[PDB]
Amino acid sequence: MTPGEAWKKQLNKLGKTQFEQYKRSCILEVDRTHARDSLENGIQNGIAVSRGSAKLRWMEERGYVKPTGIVVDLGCGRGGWSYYAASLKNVKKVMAFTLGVQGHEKPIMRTTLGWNLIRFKDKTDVFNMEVIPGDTLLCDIGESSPSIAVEEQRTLRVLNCAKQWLQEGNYTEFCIKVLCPYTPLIMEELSRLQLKHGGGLVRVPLSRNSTHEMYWVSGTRTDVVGTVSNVSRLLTRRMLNKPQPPTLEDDVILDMGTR
Numbered sequence: 001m002t003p004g005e006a007w008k009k010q011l012n013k014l015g016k017t018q019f020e021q022y023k024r025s026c027i028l029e030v031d032r033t034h035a036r037d038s039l040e041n042g043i044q045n046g047i048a049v050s051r052g053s054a055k056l057r058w059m060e061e062r063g064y065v066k067p068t069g070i071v072v073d074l075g076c077g078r079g080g081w082s083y084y085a086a087s088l089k090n091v092k093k094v095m096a097f098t099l100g101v102q103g104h105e106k107p108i109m110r111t112t113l114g115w116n117l118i119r120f121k122d123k124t125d126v127f128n129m130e131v132i133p134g135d136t137l138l139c140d141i142g143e144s145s146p147s148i149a150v151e152e153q154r155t156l157r158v159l160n161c162a163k164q165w166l167q168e169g170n171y172t173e174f175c176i177k178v179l180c181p182y183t184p185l186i187m188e189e190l191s192r193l194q195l196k197h198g199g200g201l202v203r204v205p206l207s208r209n210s211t212h213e214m215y216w217v218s219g220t221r222t223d224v225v226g227t228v229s230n231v232s233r234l235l236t237r238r239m240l241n242k243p244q245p246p247t248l249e250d251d252v253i254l255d256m257g258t259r
């Protein structure tokens, strides 16, 4: 077992309240009270449509991804990454795609800075669509499962998708979710991908401890095995220690207007 597989097995043993306590222990967390109020009421202001905006902000503020030019957002959901990207000065267009049916999050219409540069398309399976060329590739797809096998499969689908888009579309910036980075097969594929496409792996401190998600990004360089293991060891130490409440930080608030 890798440390990550070992972590997953332990996670699966937690009861309901153990799991809840664990999942937010020692993490960073944005205060979503205002955002949720605004969304429930359809109020047009600068709040982020999802928790995801803050994750992309954390990576973008550190230069791990520097959205520019034509941005594609695969698995956009409500659109938290798309709206965040659209607000950035180097960004020309955002093409955003998501399933958007049967319970899956539909894009939410907002008027934050650059909204007019986004084209949202629902009813799209990004794994079964033609590559379109662009400059920035974002993909935030990866649904957790109790089963390592299922998470591994879901992750390989995303990595196979990203590989094809990166090869055919001439992208230069990327930020790709790796749901399950810790199995041998995935680590193997990540090493191969890095050899051809560069980049590194980052753990966003806003991610909950109940997911081992990391992001493959163009604006750093890391190894695979040690970098992933370090995260496994942190998540394991947090599960063995008593839980502590998360550290709150201000959520993403964007300016308004067209670009």
Ligand SMILES: C[S@@+](CC[C@H](N)C(=O)[O-])C[C@H]1O[C@@H](n2cnc3c(N)ncnc32)[C@H](O)[C@@H]1O
Pocket: 049, 050, 051, 052, 053, 074, 075, 076, 077, 078, 079, 080, 081, 082, 097, 098, 099, 100, 104, 105, 124, 125, 126, 127, 140, 141, 142
């Ligand atoms: C983690 S959410 C993205 C959160 C988003 N980055 C945000 O900030 O709001 C991933 C989204 O991918 C969508 N999705 C999953 N599989 C997909 C697929 N095969 N094609 C298109 N969208 C998919 C899901 O419905 C979900 O809404």
